């Protein structure tokens, strides 16, 4: 506790470039996992689309897969017009 | 002498068919094995020499993106 006070007192005496570098890769390191908006970016990575969207062959049993593009079924990107 | 140390002649005499039924077996089958060896070599159809092909369980089957694959 009052060893590496010391220690880190004289790391930012000797040498604040060194400080600040290891500061900034261990924050760079620790606070993605602790973020609530990574999940918010790899949905947002998801709702591009790249290519074109193939359709299915109705077969009378597909209760959750939209007959046209306005129906209710299938995503919703209502949360990213409020993102 | 023969009471004591040896026995009869039909204890060596069966010993002896008992022998050569073995390696009589032995030399069949050494060349049968032989023979097995080169047709499955030959043809490919045998559980020996089973040389790896790619396999299917890769082939991504989905849409690419163009219809055409
Ligand atoms: C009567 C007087 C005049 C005639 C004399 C006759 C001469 C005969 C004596 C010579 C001895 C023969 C030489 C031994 C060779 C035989 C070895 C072997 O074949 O014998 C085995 C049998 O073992 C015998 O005991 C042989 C042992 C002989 C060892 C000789 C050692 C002598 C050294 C002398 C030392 C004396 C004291 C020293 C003081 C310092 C057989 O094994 P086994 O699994 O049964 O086979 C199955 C047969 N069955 C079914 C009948 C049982
Ligand atoms: C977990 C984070 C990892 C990712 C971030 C880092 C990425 C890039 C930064 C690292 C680059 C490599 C650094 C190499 C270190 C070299 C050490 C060295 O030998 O240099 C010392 C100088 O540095 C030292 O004193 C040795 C180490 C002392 C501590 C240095 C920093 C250690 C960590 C400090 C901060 C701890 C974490 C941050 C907390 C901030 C407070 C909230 C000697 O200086 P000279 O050039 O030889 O002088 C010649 C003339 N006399």
Redesign the interface.
């Known amino acids: 506790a009052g060893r590496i006070a010391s220690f880190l007192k004289n790391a930012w005496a000797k040498e604040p470039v060194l400080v600040a570098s290891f500061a900034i890769g261990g924050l760079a390191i620790i606070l993605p996992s602790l973020s609530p908006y990574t999940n918010y970016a790899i949905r947002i990575n998801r709702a591009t689309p790249y290519?074109?969207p193939?359709p299915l062959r109705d077969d009378g049993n597909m209760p959750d897969v939209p007959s046209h593009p306005q129906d209710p079924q299938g995503p919703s990107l209502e949360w990213l017009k409020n993102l | 002498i023969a009471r004591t140390f040896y026995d009869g002649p039909e204890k060596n005499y069966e010993k002896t068919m008992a022998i050569l039924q073995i390696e009589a077996e032995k030399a069949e089958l050494r060349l049968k094995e032989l023979e097995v060896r080169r047709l499955m070599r030959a043809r490919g159809d045998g559980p020996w020499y089973q040389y790896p092909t790619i396999d299917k369980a890769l082939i991504d089957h989905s849409?690419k993106?163009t219809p055409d694959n």
């Open positions: 290519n074109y193939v | 849409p993106t």
